[PDB]
Design a protein around this ligand. Structure first.
Ligand code: MC3
Ligand code: MC3
Ligand code: MC3
Ligand code: MC3
Ligand code: MC3
Ligand code: MC3
Ligand code: MC3
Ligand code: MC3
Ligand code: MC3
Ligand code: MC3
Ligand code: CL
Ligand code: CL
Ligand code: CL
Length: 544
């Protein structure tokens, strides 16, 4: 074992980090090893300014180190040529230089050099060169002097972008170029072009390559965006199980490009004992803004046989979307639907036609089980008999998911859902538009959609208002395995002045499996004389 002495602050920290690279307690020499320790100490001290120390050993081994005289900064001379002499980023860097008199750190010199080189790369100074770069160390004066003469040249500007291998018409790609021809080069614009192209889903691969062979004389940099068409068909499946609903299967078939206009088609189905759906979604990007703006035409079929609800539904939807890179989506919707249903003893055929608006956003960082993220969705729908709809109503909805991680190991998932349907003919409203609570992602511990007001005969009727929330805490026990504890609470009522909150609580497991996060929850109803017994759930739940 070895020990130091004679170092006060950071000096005793850097030396300790330098010594913990060679093995201490070991069968080793006593005049060849203490020569290895000596070289290390002097190197850690040299980096912090002390060039002329003194070290000496006794016996466990101890080493009396003395810092000695430090070399100070005598001059940080730097001259800049080209656009750098007047460039704000280069000017800003010149202040980072260490003041005269301060103790020398060799890291500051080489890092200043890295920064000169880094800014040139970022801002397109592709003719940048050091004409001089030297650090003079004068031990006689105990002074160090920079001497850098750096010539950046002039900024390169963007040329034309030529695309290769695209199955999509070129005009769509040109309208995704975030810069104008002639704009001053900026590295993040290339990154943004790559991002935008990839985000369309049109391509298997995207590589934007600058053509330096040409831009040497003109200082105008043409780009070549070579792409490969996306796989024409993709099929994802998914399976889940819950004690109340039973097994559940989802499958989606994506055709991320249907033609050279960049249209895409998604066919989806969700199958369980009580509910079955089949949906189609056809997307048509607008030429002016192919990524941010598009039309959606959706058509769907649904069948429900659940509790006191029997229903079959058909719907068509036309939507106009405005998406932002910030994550916000904004849409105007126009929905038509036909619903044949029986709720309790009430049977009806209802045709609806109504517009609506939707605002949403989803953010995520950390992968499939994100460490941080959130999702928000707010919508308003308005049906009116004046334009052919069978029922007058207004539906307001809001939902939130918030995910945050503390100290790498403590993950908090918070959810909240609000729903309000205002109408004077509730009996004609299809069950799908009414509110029921209970079940996973509603109130765990209660049966799927079992919570709602009832007809006089005891049959479920559905609610005109919905309020639910959940607090969940997860702890990363080991590796990819987490323990979870949660409480869910909410109500589905038709008179908000008359509360009837139901609360469920439970514990669970989470596993970051190769195919994504797998959850397992056990849950019971809390303080309910009418409801007892454990519900459990297993699946690939998304959280957000
Ligand atoms: C009574 C009958 C009970 C049977 C139901 C048991 C269901 C248990 C499923 C638990 C794992 C879910 C995996 C999943 O749900 O999915 C993973 C996989 C690929 O999924 P991927 O994302 O690679 O595509 O799906 C395929
Ligand atoms: C709820 C959904 C409602 C359906 C909405 C559909 C709306 C469709 C309107 C637009 C049609 C496409 C316009 C178009 O561009 O047409 C031509 C296009 C080919 O053009 P191209 O220049 O690539 O030539 C080929 C490439 N080459 C020249 C290099 C060889 O052909 C195609 O897109 C043919 C494929 C289009 C099929 C769409 C199927 C929709 C129905 C799904 C089922 C829903 C049931 C409820
Ligand atoms: C590659 C795509 C894979 C899709 C998924 C594969 C099939 C998964 C079946 C899972 C069934 C287990 C759950 C179950 O028990 O569910 C029962 C359900 C209806 O049973 P039920 O009416 O006798 O009584 C229903 C009412 N009660 C039970 C209260 C009396 O079963 C059904 O709906 C069966 C629906 C079968 C659909 C056949 C495939 C069409 C896919 C087209 C679109 C694909 C786009 C990607
Ligand atoms: C809501 C839909 C909004 C419009 C979708 C726009 C769209 O995706 O337009 C694609 C295409 C345009 O065809 P186009 O001949 O006007 O110009 C083609 C170019 N060219 C004359 C030089 C050969 O539309 C088609 O193929 C048929 C579009 C279906 C009608 C809606
Ligand atoms: C309603 C009609 C709005 C008309 C304004 C022009 C919309 C547009 O065609 O272009 C501007 C901008 C594109 O988005 P931006 O990137 O300026 O933000 O409109 C927007 O954002 C408008 C978002 C509309 C959300 C409706 C819910
Ligand atoms: C925006 C207004 C333009 C569309 C109005 C369609 C409409 O106003 O269409 C009323 C139609 C007869 O009205 P009615 O007295 O049968 O109810 O009915 C319907 O169902 C129309 C079904 C919706 C397609
Ligand atoms: C219990 C939850 C514990 C959360 C742990 C917070 C960790 C530090 C904040 C990290 C962050 O990033 O904090 C900013 C975030 C909004 O992020 P932004 O990007 O909108 O700005 O602040 C937030 O409170 C996130 C929303 C959490 C609200 C859920 C608690 C409601 C309790 C009801 C009873
Ligand atoms: C249900 C919510 C549970 C949240 C648990 C979060 C635990 C976070 C521990 C973080 C340790 C970091 C280690 C560290 O570096 O330093 C210790 C750290 C301060 O930093 O210590 C702390 O954060 C002390 C945190 C004290 C949290 C107090 C929670 C009381 C719950 C009582 C429940 C009673 C039920 C009947
Ligand atoms: C945005 C995220 C918000 C997260 C909020 C999570 C709330 C967690 C509830 C914890 C329940 C306490 C335990 C209990 O057992 O509490 C019983 C008691 C009613 O029992 P009682 O006296 O009838 O017998 O609790 C009640 O009433 C309390 C009912 C609380 C539900 C409120 C949820 C509204 C959030 C939606 C906002 C969405 C915005 C987009
Ligand atoms: C690593 C992988 C671990 C996966 C397995 C976790 C351990 C649990 C396995 C036992 C579950 C079991 O064999 O059968 C399920 C059973 C159902 O109960 P029931 O009332 O429906 O029927 C009872 C009969 N009767 C209705 C007539 C009264 O449930 C129970 O036994 C309740 C078990 C509660 C376990 C709590 C787990 C905490 C995990 C913390 C996180 C660690 C990371
Ligand atoms: Cl268009
Ligand atoms: Cl809608
Ligand atoms: Cl009814």
């Amino acid at each position: 074992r070895l020990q130091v002495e004679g170092l006060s602050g950071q000096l005793e920290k850097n030396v300790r980090a330098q010594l913990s690279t060679i093995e201490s307690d070991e069968v080793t020499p006593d005049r060849r090893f203490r020569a290895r320790v000596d070289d290390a100490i002097r190197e850690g001290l040299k980096a912090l300014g002390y060039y002329q120390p003194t070290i000496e050993f006794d016996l466990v081994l101890i080493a009396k180190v003395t810092p000695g005289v430090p070399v100070l900064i005598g001059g940080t001379d730097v001259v800049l040529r080209g656009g750098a002499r007047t460039d704000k980023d280069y000017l800003k860097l010149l202040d980072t230089r260490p003041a005269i008199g301060t103790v020398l750190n060799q890291g500051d010199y080489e890092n200043f050099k890295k920064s000169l080189t880094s800014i040139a790369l970022r801002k397109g100074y592709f003719d940048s060169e050091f004409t001089k770069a030297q650090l003079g160390i004068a031990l006689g004066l105990h002074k160090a002097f920079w001497d850098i003469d750096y010539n950046s040249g002039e900024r390169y500007r963007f040329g034309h972008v030529t695309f290769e291998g695209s199955q999509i018409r070129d005009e769509y790609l040109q309208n995704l170029v975030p810069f104008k021809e002639g704009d001053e080069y900026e590295s993040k614009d290339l990154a943004e072009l790559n991002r935008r192209l990839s985000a369309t889903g049109w391509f298997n691969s995207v590589v934007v390559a600058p053509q330096f062979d040409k831009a040497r004389e003109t200082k105008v940099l043409p780009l070549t965006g070579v792409v490969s068409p996306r796989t024409e068909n993709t099929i994802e499946t998914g399976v889940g199980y819950s004690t109340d609903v039973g097994p559940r299967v989802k499958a989606t078939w994506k055709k991320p490009w249907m033609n050279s206009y960049g249209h895409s088609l998604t066919t989806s189905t969700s199958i369980s004992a009580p509910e079955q759906t089949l949906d189609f979604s056809y997307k048509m990007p607008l030429l002016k803004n192919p990524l941010e703006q598009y039309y959606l035409v959706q058509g769907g079929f649904k069948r429900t046989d659940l509790n006191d609800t029997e229903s079959d539904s058909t719907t068509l939807v036309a939507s106009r979307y405005w998406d932002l890179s910030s994550g916000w989506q904004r849409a105007i919707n126009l929905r038509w639907s036909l619903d044949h249903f029986t709720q309790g003893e009430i049977t009806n055929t209802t045709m609806l036609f109504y517009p609506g608006v939707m605002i949403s956003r989803t953010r995520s960082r950390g992968g499939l089980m994100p460490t941080w993220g959130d999702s928000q969705r707010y919508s308003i729908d308005y049906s009116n008999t004046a334009w052919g709809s069978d029922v007058d109503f207004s539906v307001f909805q809001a939902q939130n998911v918030w995910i945050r991680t503390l100290y790498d190991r403590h993950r908090f998932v918070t959810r909240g859902t609000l729903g309000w349907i205002e109408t004077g003919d509730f009996d004609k409203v299809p069950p799908d538009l009414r509110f029921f609570a209970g079940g996973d992602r509603s109130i765990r511990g209660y049966k799927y959609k079992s919570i709602a007001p009832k007809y006089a005969n005891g049959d479920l009727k559905g609610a005109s208002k919905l309020i639910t929330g959940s607090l969940e805490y997860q702890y990363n026990v080991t590796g990819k395995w987490w323990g979870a504890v949660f409480v869910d609470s909410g109500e589905a009522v038709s008179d908000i002045r008359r509360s009837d909150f139901k609360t469920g609580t439970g514990v669970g497991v989470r596993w970051e499996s190769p195919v994504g996060p797998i959850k397992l929850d056990f849950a019971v109803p809390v303080a309910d004389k009418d409801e007892h017994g454990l519900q459990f759930y297993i699946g690939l739940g998304p959280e957000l």
